[PDB]
């Protein structure tokens, strides 16, 4: 979203029952919205306002924090929201499309589509078109409509696969259509010709974005988490970004007149990619990331109470601040032979990775002097130490000397008040 | 400059009746359109004048017309 009175771009991501706003310059949080009773299912932005849908009712947010307008009158869940000037377009599950004036909250027009014949799966309003919207269907047909006249201008036979994405190309009359088979079709809607076709064998087309910084590059996402970069000029594949996100790609967008790509996913990560390297190799520029796996153990750390230590199934220890997210920090992965990790990075060294932490105990005294966290891993005899100030794993693995095998495991850990000693229990029944 | 450069060297399938009409829309008193005005005379532009105005703003924002588009 672009902003008035501030020549900056803002990116808004849905977080459960709320949404967050970040500046794209430095990924700094600028606002947090108020909660809504149900989980947000669809979102839209028109510069002035942010629209969020939950259940069968959707509301409009002002100042990125509070609601000012709510709209009732839908009997089914909403999957699509299209801002249209001072009006908003909402599409229901059963097939009802209603145009609402935002301020007066009245219903301008109500249109219904047969679910068997034409179920809407994608909506697009082409640029420089007067009162015209483009509708895509799972059956595969496309319909061009005029809201003002309330008549069907033209019907595109399309393709038998079905439409999953609609995106405006950097041209007056050209749109990009994604299909369930993995095929991207560049089409001119005025004269009905297909300029070019691209195909990826990774599943349905999730999202499409166009690079407008002077290089003709198109990006399409996949549910596998891969992104394909296609050259529009030469009609070829430039390069592929594999495992950009571990989960499915949700939305990818090139910043306007910028060589930057903004991606998010279900792995609780928001990432920025810059294509400035040789041969157009994208690299990670900035990221705001949390735990990508369900949590195992969480405990308050410190008597002041502004931070909480959390462990997850991804094999990482992290601290979350309770006052502001600028103080969030990560202690890294559980890794033996840390010096090898420096040489090769986290990847290609998956062998030295430790099993996820199940239980841990932390003590705050002597944290400057030495380690203050003891943790026991899943199905592992030894217990590992962690350092809070150094934000990394410790230098000791605490085990009985006589045992070497992993048939016996560690079950209970504790640390003393002074922090000098740690007490570890074993499944065999020995306490050391 | 142009002299120096020399020395160195269908039919649309659909139509909209609301667009063919020569009706005028208020460029002023609309928040989005008032930023698109050029001189004071264009308080209300016709349908044809609006189309080329909208088109050239899109091309200026996009940085021109891409080569693959034609």
């Amino acid at each position: 979203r672009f902003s008035a009175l501030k020549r900056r771009f803002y990116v808004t991501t849905c977080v459960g029952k709320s949404f967050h706003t970040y500046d794209v310059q430095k990924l700094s949080l600028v606002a947090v919205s108020n909660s809504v009773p149900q989980d947000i299912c669809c979102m839209a932005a028109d510069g002035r306002l942010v629209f969020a849908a939950y259940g069968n009712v959707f509301s409009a947010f002002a100042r990125n924090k509070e609601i000012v307008h709510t709209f009732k009158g839908h009997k089914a869940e909403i999957h699509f929201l299209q801002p249209f000037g001072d009006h908003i377009i909402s599409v229901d599950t059963d097939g009802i499309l209603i145009i609402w004036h935002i301020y007066s909250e009245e219903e301008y027009l109500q249109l219904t589509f047969d679910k068997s014949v034409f179920k809407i799966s994608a909506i697009l309003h082409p640029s420089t078109y007067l009162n015209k919207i483009l509708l895509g269907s799972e059956q595969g047909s496309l319909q061009l409509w005029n809201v003002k006249s309330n008549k069907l201008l033209y019907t595109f036979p399309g393709w038998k696969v079905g439409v999953t994405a609609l995106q405006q190309a950097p041209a007056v009359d050209v749109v990009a259509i994604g299909l369930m088979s993995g095929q991207v079709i560049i089409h001119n809607i005025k004269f009905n010709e297909t300029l070019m076709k691209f195909r990826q064998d990774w599943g349905p087309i999730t999202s499409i974005s166009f690079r407008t910084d002077g290089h003709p590059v198109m990006a399409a996402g996949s549910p596998c988490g891969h992104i394909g970069l296609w050259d529009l000029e030469d009609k070829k594949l430039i390069n592929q970004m594999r495992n950009a996100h571990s989960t499915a790609i949700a939305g990818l967008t090139f910043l306007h007149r910028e060589p930057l790509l903004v991606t998010n996913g279900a792995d609780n990560a928001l990432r920025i990619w810059i294509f400035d390297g040789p041969t157009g190799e994208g690299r990670l520029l900035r990221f705001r990331m949390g735990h990508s796996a369900p949590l195992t153990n969480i405990r308050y750390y410190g008597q002041n109470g502004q931070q909480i230590l959390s462990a997850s199934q991804d094999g990482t220890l992290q601290s979350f601040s309770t006052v502001h997210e600028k103080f969030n920090k990560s202690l890294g992965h559980g890794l033996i032979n840390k010096k090898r990790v420096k040489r090769k990075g986290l990847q290609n060294t998956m062998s030295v990775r430790l099993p996820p932490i199940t239980k841990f105990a932390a003590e705050e005294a002597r944290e400057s002097d030495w380690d203050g966290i003891i943790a026991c891993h899943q199905g592992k005899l030894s217990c590992s130490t962690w350092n809070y100030q150094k934000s990394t794993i410790g230098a000791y693995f605490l085990k009985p000397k006589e045992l070497k095998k992993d048939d016996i495991t560690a079950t209970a850990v504790d640390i003393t008040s002074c922090g000098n000693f740690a007490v570890i229990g074993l499944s065999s029944g020995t306490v050391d | 400059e142009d002299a120096l450069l020399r020395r160195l060297r269908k039919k649309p399938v659909w139509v909209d009746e609301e667009d063919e009409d020569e009706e005028m829309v208020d460029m002023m008193n609309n928040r989005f359109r008032k930023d698109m005005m050029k001189n004071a005379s264009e308080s209300k532009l016709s349908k044809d004048n609006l189309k080329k105005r909208l088109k050239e703003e899109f091309q200026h924002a996009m940085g021109g017309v891409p080569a693959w588009a034609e």
């Binding site: 249209f84 000037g85 001072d86 009006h87 004036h101 301020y103 007066s104 301008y108 009162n131 | 829309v25």
Partner: peptide, 7 residues
């Protein structure tokens, strides 16, 4: 957009 606000 040029839709009328009311009706």
């Amino acid at each position: 957009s040029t839709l009328p606000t009311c009706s």
